[PDB]
Every structure is written in structure tokens, then in C-alpha cells.
Amino acid sequence: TEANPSNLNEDDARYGFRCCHLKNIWSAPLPPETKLAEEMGIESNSIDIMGLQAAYAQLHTEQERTYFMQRYRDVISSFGGSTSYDADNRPLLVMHTDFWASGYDVDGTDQSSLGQFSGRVQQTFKHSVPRFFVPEHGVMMTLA
Amino acid sequence: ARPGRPQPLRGTKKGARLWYVGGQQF
Amino acid sequence: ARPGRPQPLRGTKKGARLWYVGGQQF
Amino acid sequence: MYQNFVTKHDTAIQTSRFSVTGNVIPAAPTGNIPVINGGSITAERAVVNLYANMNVSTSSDGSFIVAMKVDTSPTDPNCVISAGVNLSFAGTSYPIVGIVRFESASEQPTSIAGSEVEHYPIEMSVGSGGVCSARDCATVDIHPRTSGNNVFVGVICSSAKWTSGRVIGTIATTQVIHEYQVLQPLK
Amino acid sequence: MYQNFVTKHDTAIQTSRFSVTGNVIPAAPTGNIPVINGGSITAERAVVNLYANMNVSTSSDGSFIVAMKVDTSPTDPNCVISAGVNLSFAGTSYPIVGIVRFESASEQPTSIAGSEVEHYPIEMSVGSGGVCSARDCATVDIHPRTSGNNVFVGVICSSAKWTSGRVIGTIATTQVIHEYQVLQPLK
Amino acid sequence: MYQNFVTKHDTAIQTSRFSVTGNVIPAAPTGNIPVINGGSITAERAVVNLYANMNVSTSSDGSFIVAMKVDTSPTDPNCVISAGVNLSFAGTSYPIVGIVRFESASEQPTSIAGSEVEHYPIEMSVGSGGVCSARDCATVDIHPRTSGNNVFVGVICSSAKWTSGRVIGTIATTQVIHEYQVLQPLK
Amino acid sequence: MYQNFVTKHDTAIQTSRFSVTGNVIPAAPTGNIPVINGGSITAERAVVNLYANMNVSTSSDGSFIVAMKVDTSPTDPNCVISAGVNLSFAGTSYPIVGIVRFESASEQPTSIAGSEVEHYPIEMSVGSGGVCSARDCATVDIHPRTSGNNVFVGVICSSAKWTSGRVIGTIATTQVIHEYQVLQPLK
Amino acid sequence: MYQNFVTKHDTAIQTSRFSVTGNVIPAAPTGNIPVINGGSITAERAVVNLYANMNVSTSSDGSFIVAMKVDTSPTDPNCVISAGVNLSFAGTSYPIVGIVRFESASEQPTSIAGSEVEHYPIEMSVGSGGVCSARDCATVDIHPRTSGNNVFVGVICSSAKWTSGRVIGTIATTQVIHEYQVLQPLK
DNA sequence: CAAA
DNA sequence: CAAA
């Protein structure tokens, strides 16, 4: 929520915000507040099986959300609807490319460096954005 | 025995979904 | 991902005129 | 920073060590120089620890030697011989060192005539009144010039004016025909 | 000009420091040498600051030691061990230094027998009457020769004639199994 | 022959100079050490000219410091810090030098507690009775270890037995984050 | 072994030599320092032979200079300036040297104010009581900072306590803008 | 570690040796300097052993020389000339050395006028009261500047205040036009 | 990416 | 380059 670029700390303001590690078992867990048990009210000696029914259904709607519908758009999409980018005021992803950065090793050639190697990563790349129609004044931002 | 000159390894990358986190995360 | 071996960048170079300076200047 | 792995002298590792105590009788080049080794190092890498008394029973200006038997296996005409010394004397005498080569049909030379000793100067780390230090090397033909003798090399220590007194330190010397391998973190 | 980034000894950075004050009792190689470390540095990079009195309660000619526990993890037979010393004595005694290796089943050695100490000479920056300086290294087998002991290395300081008096300076020593990274402006 | 263009220390060029005269009050590590800089060099390259009297108003065995404020811009964990000193004392005291690092929320430190000073030994060109010389460097973490302070580095000069008397010379020190370009005839 | 062809200072060859005899009047940085050159070397490579008497008609603690006129042709901002000195004094005074840069509209400076002299420390080979030796260099901006003057460089020699007496040796200095070619047997 | 195979001076091997005893009559640059060689080394690699008395029959401040005849075959304008000295004097006089070049139609020069001698300073390993040490080299034009003479080079030794007394050591010098081959274990 |  |  940082109001101004001055509410930003040393590292961030200069280098950009941090992002998430590539998804794996520990870097992409289930939202921490994930329900691990759903309690349902019971009388003292009886249980409304018809209620227990709704109970589950209700839980469902809750999980569906927790798991993958935390954003409004996702909820709507869930019903089989749509949402303009103007609906939840979201940047419009115009283009997204990616690649693996490879390179080569430089060999050591002097008395002590001979047999040593330094890696010089160095990958070329294109990032093309198809003609795009800009409906309203704004900004086209490209980040890496 | 493969001829080529040693290449650095890339991505650890399939079937259906694995990571549910609430929505899209890059 | 593009194969080639890294090339240094050249000119920042189109439509109609931009620079009026009184005449020709190289 | 980057650790330096080159050096003018590699001190023998676990082997070739002899401790020498007693009286060291420096001598002049006109006579026979004292080779303070009875159990003279072999492997041609020698480390000698000194804890003895520098006695002037003979002349006041002389020199003593520490030596080793050169391995002559190598077909190469000559190889490098490094030395690393650290001597602290009690009696201010302004020590001095260098490397030497001499032959002798004798396996365990006790002394060598001065007119039979070859000199090879080396940068002296220090040469103060009571402490000479040096870690350097020199090129020396390793083959016996007279069909029959054994070749010897070592560091010699001299002075223009000695002074009775205890001396302590180490005299290391090696024939480079092997460079000790070593953990270099970046390889 | 171009800045030199290589060096015979890299002084440990923020860690491994111990200050030692009091009386340093130099000894002769015939007895047990004083290892002025109770809290002996571990990481096998050691920096020791000296501000004590060089006392001759025993012999007038001896030597004291500063040591560290060698990391034996590396499968490499032996690695480099560098030292960087700067000692200024009050009592002119012509100091002297070098690197040493010795084992002991004891974790925090207080003293080590002289006949149980291995020497490795090093170029002494200076060896004046009251100040010895040196920044060098040597090759040393890092594995325990006797199944069971811990391996120790460090710089030893000796003299042919000590002299009661305050001594001050720093004794740094490191087992090179890591080269400190460093800002090199042109890379 | 071929001119050598590498060097352990590049003395700042036209900037960062301060002349210091007066009385230098050496101190012991148990107290607060004198940092003879009021107008402490900034650019983290410092050249200090000495023409003052080494006075022993306090203890006879101590040490004084010359320092500079480390530039912390570099994201690199740590960079090299070189020093080049040439001091000639009148009163024979066997000087000694080295590099140091210490922090302080104060912008212009006048003195620093000894238990708050980190040492980094360096090969001393010379350490005679009345003149210490040295041109070397060392690796030092350039970032403030305590959120808030400024990092300082410089050369420290000590002695086991000082002696009232005039001292003269230069104390240069620099944080290598730039290598001075230079006319090399063959390129 | 392999001959080393690199070096911090190449002494001018057949040219630029001036012998200087007489009285050398060392001075303090508060006054004007003596530039013992009337026929100041030009080619910016200078060799000066000393055979004069170090006289203390002024202060007991000072410094004298030997200089040369910097060639400013090179468009390079600054180049290396090496010096190689060997001075032996009679009167123990613990000499000291370094390189300096100073300007002056005067073509043949006889003396220069101390507050107008820039210092550049250099590793001193030795700095004993009666002999200073050094062969090193430093980076120096070769262009006149004040539109109009000529730039001068050279080695300065100082002492905390001078002592009337004869001095002898050589003061060599050069602006590296040429590396002397040399027979290298293997090319 | 890796053995260093480069060096500023390679001492001649089995040849070019001459022992010199007797009285060495140091002289001043105003007169003719003593060239202690009658059987002056030829091959232009010279090793001279000293065991003589430094006598002051003339002036108290002077210099003596050791020389060799430069091989002029090489078409190269000039080549390197290295020297390696180790001298220990009895009489404290703070020696000093350097390399020199001088011509003479005479094949075996006995002395050379000071105004006819060219100097080339070299880093002195040490220059204590009674011992000078040095292993260095310098660039020298090897061709006779005056159609007819022979070119000579060697190390000169001077002092500001000599002192009658025995001197001992070695004076080695060589014209590098050959690098001695050497067993390098890893090739 | 509801591998709804 | 009158992107007259």
C-alpha cells in the first residue's frame, strides 16, 4: 500500500519489490489460513443431517475461495462470467515472455589460474509486443 | 556417451495442477 | 531465447521531421 | 582477496627433519667449513632446527653450513633449489646467508674445504644485527661434475665478526622436483 | 594504477578474535612451549591481539606460540596456512617468527613439548631489535597423523636472548579453504 | 624493461589531504585511542601529512590512529583497503603499523575505545628504531554491523616503548572501489 | 630460471644525469624546501648522484627534494612516476623517502613552499639509521592544475632528527611514457 | 604450493668465478674508483667471493667496484643486467649497492674515474649497519658509445662513513642473454 | 487454468 | 528535406 516512493525502503526503491521463488512444495504452499477442520453445531443427542448437508456445501464455497478465488475477478469467472480490467482496476498484461539465461566458461591460463573457470552468463533475447490499441491515456510499463 | 560440449541445466519442469495459492502468482 | 552471441547496441534511430535548427547541421 | 599460491621455497612437509644442538665452530674459507649434519637429510628437502651455541674456538670471522644430498635421478641438466632460513643470534654479528653446492665421495660430509664450495646469493629477507631471514632459491646444475662424487647443496651462514652466543631458528632447504599440491578453494 | 588483489595472507574478518594480556613465559625447545591460547580460535582463521609483558621467569632464550585448530573436513591432503604478524617489543631481543603444526588429543592446549612441534620458515618482513613483522604462508598436511588427535597450526615467536618487557601487536593466522570475495572495480 | 602497473596501494591523487601538527598522545588498548583527525577524510582515500611531537603525557606504550569514513554505497559485501605509510621518529621506539576498522555514530570521531577496534596486520616495509614504512592492503567488510553507525578504517601506529620526540612523514589510506587509469605506453 | 622483466622503476639510460655536491640544507614543511637542482633534469627521467654534506644550518628536522619537469604532451590524464633511491648517510638520522608533485611558473625551481607540495608514499626498500633505499612508483596527474605553471615531480627525503654529515648515493626518477625494450632470450 | 620460477637475478652456474682477498681501498667519486678485478670475469656473468680487509688508506667515505666485460654480440640495443650481493662487514658503515656501466679501451681495468661511471639504483634487500643484500637488475645499453672501448658493468658498493675491518660475502652479476633451463615438475 |  |  505504500503511498509515496519515499515510504519505500533502501533496497525496494532501488531494486524493485521482491517476488516469489519458483513454485515448489515449500515456496508454493496452501494459503496459511487454510481450513484444517470445519466445526458444525450439534444439539446434545441429535444432529441435523439436512443441516450437516448445507454445512458441507457452505464449507465448499469457502474452500473454493480460500484455494483459488481470493480475487474478485476469479470469483466472477467462477460463475462463468467476465470482468473488465476496469472492474477491479487491474493493470492489463499485454505481453509476457521468458527464457533461460545460458553462457560459457572462461578458462584460466596462468600458473595458478590454469585449471580454474569463471562462468559468464550471457543470453540474447527478443521480447515482442503485438500492435496494441490504447483506449485511454496511460502508461506502457515493461519490467523484468 | 554423448558428443556435445557440456550445457548448463535449465528448469525443473506435465500433468494437472499442483499449486493452489488463492489466485495467480508469478 | 535467441541463439546469437551478444552484439553491442547501435543507433537510437521513422516519421516526419523533429529537429529544426535553422538549416543543415551534421 | 585472492590467496597467493606461488612461493620461492616450499618447506618439506612431514619428513626430513633433524635437530642440531651443541657448538657450531664457524670457519674461514681458507680452511675447512663445518657442515653441522651427521645425519644429513636425504630426500633432498631438508629442515634443520637450531638450538646451539655459536662458539669462536677458531677464527672470529667465518661461516657454517647446513646441507642435503641432491637427488640426481632427473635427466634435466639442473633444477631449482630453494631455502628458507630464520636465525636469531644472541651475539650481534650481522649474519648472512646464501645457497651452496659442493661434491664429495663421502656420504655424510662433516666439513668441506672452502676452495671446494660454490656460492649462489639470495635475497635476504632481513640481515639485522642478530637475525638473518631469507626465503629464496637459485638454479643449480644437479649432476656430479667429477665422475664418482655425490652432489650437495644447502644454505651457508657467514659473518664478518662473529660473537660467542646461543643461536636459534630453522634452516630449511629443498630441491624442487615436486610442487606440493594444495587446496585452492576456487578450483 | 591497477590494484593488486593477491596476497600471501588474508586476515580473518569479523570473527575469530581473542585478546591476550598478562605474562608470556617464553621457553626452550627442550621443555614445553607456552601456547598463549585458552580460548583457542576455532574457524581456523585466528587473530590475536597482544598487550602483555614478556617475562623471563624461566630461560633467557626461548619461544612462545599462538595457535588455531585446523579444520579437517577438506579431503585434500593439505592446504595453505598463512600468517601475518606485527610485534613490537620494548626489550631489544631480535624476535623471530614462523609457522608451526602440532597435534594433541587436548581440545584447548596450554603448552606443547618442543620435540612435538613442526617448523615452517617464512619470509620475515622485518626482524629489527624490537619489532618482527611478517605476512606469509606455507604448505601443511591438514590431516591428523595419529588416529585421534586434533591438528594445530599457528605462528611461533622465538629469540636467542629475550629481555623482560611489554610487547604489543597482532598475531593473525588462517587456513586457506576460502578466498574472501572483493569489489574489483573493473569486473 | 617492462614497467609494473600493479600495486598494493594507490595514494589518493589531488584530493583528500589534511595536514596534522601538534601533540600526538599515544594510548593503550585499555583506554580510548587518539584519532588524530578532526577534519576526517571523506572520499575514503586519505592522505595525512605528519609534522608533530610524539608526546607521552599518558602511558609509555600505546598507539595512535589515522582514519577515514568508508563509502558504503557498494553492494559488494566487502572491498580492499590499502595503506601506505612512511614515518620517521626522532625518539627510537620501534614503531609499528596495521589497518583498522571501527564504527561510531559520530561523524568526526576524536578517539575510539580499544575494545572497539578491529585489527588487520600488513607486511611492514621496514620497522627500524626510528622509521616504519609500509605499503599494503587488506580485506574488510564495508557494511555497518550495527544498524546506524558509520564505518571507519585507517592505519594504526603502535609501540612497546614510545619516546617523546618529533615525528614526520605521510599516512595514506584508500578504499579500493576505483583503480586509477594510467598511461601504459604499449596500449 | 626465468628472468623477471617487469619492475617498478626503470632508471634512465644514457641521458638526464646531473651530479650534485656541496651543502644540502634540509628544511621543515612550514618553510621553503630545498630543491637541489639548478640544472633540473628535463626528459622527465632523472638520475642524480649525491656526494655532499648534509648540513643543519636551519632546523634539525626537515627534508630536501630532487625533482624533474613533467612532460605534459600525453593526453592521458595521468601516468606513472617511478623512483629508485639509494642513500647512505654518515650521521645516523633514519632517512625517509617518497614521491612528490608540485607546480611553479619557474622553469628551474630552487626551492618550494611545503604547503605547495603533494605527497605520494612508496614502499621503502630499507630505512636503517644511515641508509634509505627504495624502488617504487605512484600514480600522478600530469597536467598543470593552474593554467600556466610547469609540473614537477621527484623524490623527497626527510628525517625526524637530521645529523650533520656526508651523504652519498643516487636519486633516480622517471615518468613512465616509455618502457625500455630489452633482449629477452626466448623471443 | 606452486614453486616460483621467475627471478630478478640468476647467479652464473659452474663458470666465471674469482676469489678476491687482500685490501680493498674505497675511494671518492672525485678520484679513481678501485675495480677489484685483475682477472675480470668474461662470459658476462660474474661471481666474486670476498674475504678481504676493508682498508681506509685513502678517504673515509668512498666506494669500490666489481665488474664484468659486456658481451656485445647481441644486435638488441640493450639488455638486462642483474646482480645479487650479500656482504657482511665487521666495521659498521651502512654499506650500499647498485649497478654500474663504464667503458675503457683497457681489457682488464684496475680502476675507473668516478666522472666516467654510470649509475643504476636497485632495490636493496637490506642495508643494515654491517650487511647489505640485494638481488635485482636494470636496463643498460650494451653497445660501446665511443667507437673502440669495451663495455663494463657490475655492482658498486659505497658508504658515507667506512670503517677499517674484514668484509665477507659474494658479488654476483649477469647480463641476461640466456635464461637457465630448469626442471619444472609439472611440464 | 476451479486440471470446476 | 519547409515532412512547405
Distance CA(F73)–CA(F71), nearest Å, equals 6
E108 touches chain H (CB under 8 A): no
Residues 3-22 of B with CB under 7 A from strand I: 16-17
| DSSP per position, E70-129 | ------SSEEEEEEEEEEEESS----EEEEEEEEES-SS-SEEEGGG-EEE----SEE-S
Neighbours of H178 (CB within 10 A): 15
Alpha-carbon torsion H173, G136, G124, E52, what sign? negative
Question: Using only C-alpha atoms, what is the Rg of chain H?
Answer: 16
Closest CA to E124 of D157, H126, D48, D133: D133
Task: Give residue E164's identity as a one-letter amino acid code.
Answer: S
Residue numbers preceding breaks in chain C (C to N > 2.5 A): 13
- The residues facing F105 across adjacent strands are none
Neighbours of A5 (CB within 10 A): 8
Distance CA(G177)–CA(G136), nearest Å, equals 16
Distance CA(H37)–CA(H39), nearest Å, equals 5
Closest CA to G92 of G169, G147, G162, G185: G162
A132 touches chain C (CB under 8 A): no
- The residues facing D186 across adjacent strands are none
Question: Which residue is closest to A113 within chain D, CA to CA?
Answer: D187
**Pair type for strands G17-24 and G45-54:** parallel
Is H6 within 8 Å of G7 when comparing Cβ atoms? no
Contact A71, A85 (CB under 8 A): no
Neighbours of D43 (CB within 10 A): 14
Mutation test of the interface with chain D: which of G1, G4, G128, G131, choosing the one with the most D Cβ atoms within 10 A?
G1
| DSSP per position, G4-66 | P-EES-----SS-EEEEEEEE----TTSEEEB--SS-B-SSEEEEEEEEEE--SS-SS-EEEE
Distance CA(D61)–CA(D26), nearest Å, equals 7
Query: What 3-state DSSP class applies to A86?
Result: coil
Note whether B touches H: 3 CB pairs or more under 8 A: no
Based on the number of CB atoms within 10 Å of its own CB, is H40 exposed (0-12), middle (13-18) or buried (19 or more)? buried
Based on the number of CB atoms within 10 Å of its own CB, is A23 exposed (0-12), middle (13-18) or buried (19 or more)? middle
Distance CA(F50)–CA(F170), nearest Å, equals 6
- The residues facing F173 across adjacent strands are F46, F83
Residue the block writes with cell 685513502: H58
Contact G145, G90 (CB under 8 A): no
Distance CA(A76)–CA(D157), nearest Å, equals 94
Nucleotide with smallest C1' distance to residue C21 CA: J2
Closest residue (CA) to C1' of nucleotide I1 is B17
Q: How far is G149 from chain H (nearest CA, A)?
A: 30
Residue B14 CA, nucleotide I3 C1', distance (Å): 11
Pull the grid cell for residue C18. Answer: 523533429
Closest CA to E183 of F103, A113, F175: F175
Residues of E in Cβ contact (< 8 Å) with F173: none
Contact D111, D32 (CB under 8 A): yes
Is A125 within 8 Å of C2 when comparing Cβ atoms? yes
Distance CA(G157)–CA(G167), nearest Å, equals 12
Residue numbers preceding breaks in chain H (C to N > 2.5 A): none
Question: Which residue is closest to D129 within chain F, CA to CA?
Answer: F128
Distance CA(D12)–CA(E120), nearest Å, equals 8
Distance CA(F99)–CA(F123), nearest Å, equals 11
In angstroms, the first-to-last Cα distance of chain H is 16
Closest partner residue to F127 (CB to CB) among E49, E84, E133 is E133
Q: How far is E139 from chain H (nearest CA, A)?
A: 6
Residues 25-54 of F with CB under 8 A from G: 47, 49, 51
Element spanning E153, H or E: strand E150-158
Nucleotide with smallest C1' distance to residue C17 CA: J3
Question: Which residue is closest to F171 within chain G, CA to CA?
Answer: G121
Is H122 within 8 Å of G129 when comparing Cβ atoms? no
- The residues facing E86 across adjacent strands are E133, E170
Residue the block writes with cell 611545503: G114
Nucleotide with smallest C1' distance to residue B21 CA: I2
CATH 1.20.5.440 holds for G1-187: no
Distance CA(D24)–CA(D17), nearest Å, equals 18
Is D5 within 8 Å of A116 when comparing Cβ atoms? no
Is G11 within 8 Å of H121 when comparing Cβ atoms? yes
Contact H132, H97 (CB under 8 A): yes
Distance CA(D60)–CA(H168), nearest Å, equals 12
**Pair type for strands H17-24 and H45-54:** parallel
D1 touches chain F (CB under 8 A): yes
Alpha-carbon torsion F20, F24, F26, F30, what sign? negative
Burial D139-151 (b: 16+ CB within 10 A, else e): bbbbeeeeeeebb
Alpha-carbon torsion D173, D176, D181, D185, what sign? positive
Closest residue (CA) to C1' of nucleotide I4 is A78
Residue the block writes with cell 535553422: C22
Q: Which residues 6+ apart lie within 8 Å of B24 measured at CB?
A: A71
Burial G33-59 (b: 16+ CB within 10 A, else e): bbbbbeebbeebbbbbbbbbebebeee
Distance CA(F154)–CA(F100), nearest Å, equals 5
Residues of A in Cβ contact (< 8 Å) with B12: 22, 24
Contact F9, F46 (CB under 8 A): no
Note whether F touches C: 3 CB pairs or more under 8 A: no
Question: Which H, E and C letters describe D152-169, residue by residue?
Answer: EEEEEEECCCCCCEEEEE
Pull the grid cell for residue F159. Answer: 609501540
**Where are the domains positioned within chain G?**
1-187
Q: In Å, what resolution does this model reach?
A: 3.5
Nucleotide with smallest C1' distance to residue C16 CA: J3
E80 touches chain H (CB under 8 A): yes
Taking the CA atoms of residue H172, residue H177, residue H182 and residue H187 in that order, the dihedral angle to the nearest 10 degrees is 150
Count chain A–chain D contacts defined by CB atoms under 8 A: 9
Question: Technique behind this structure?
Answer: X-ray
Distance CA(G44)–CA(G140), nearest Å, equals 13
Question: Subunits touching A (CB < 8 Å, at least 3 pairs)?
Answer: B, C, D
Distance CA(H93)–CA(H165), nearest Å, equals 10
Residue the block writes with cell 646482480: H83
Task: Give residue A67's identity as a one-letter amino acid code.
Answer: Y
| DSSP per position, H61-108 | S-EEEEEEE------SSEEEEEEEEEEEESS----EEEEEEEEES-SS
Burial E104-122 (b: 16+ CB within 10 A, else e): beeeebebbebeebbbbbb
Query: What 3-state DSSP class applies to D116?
Result: helix
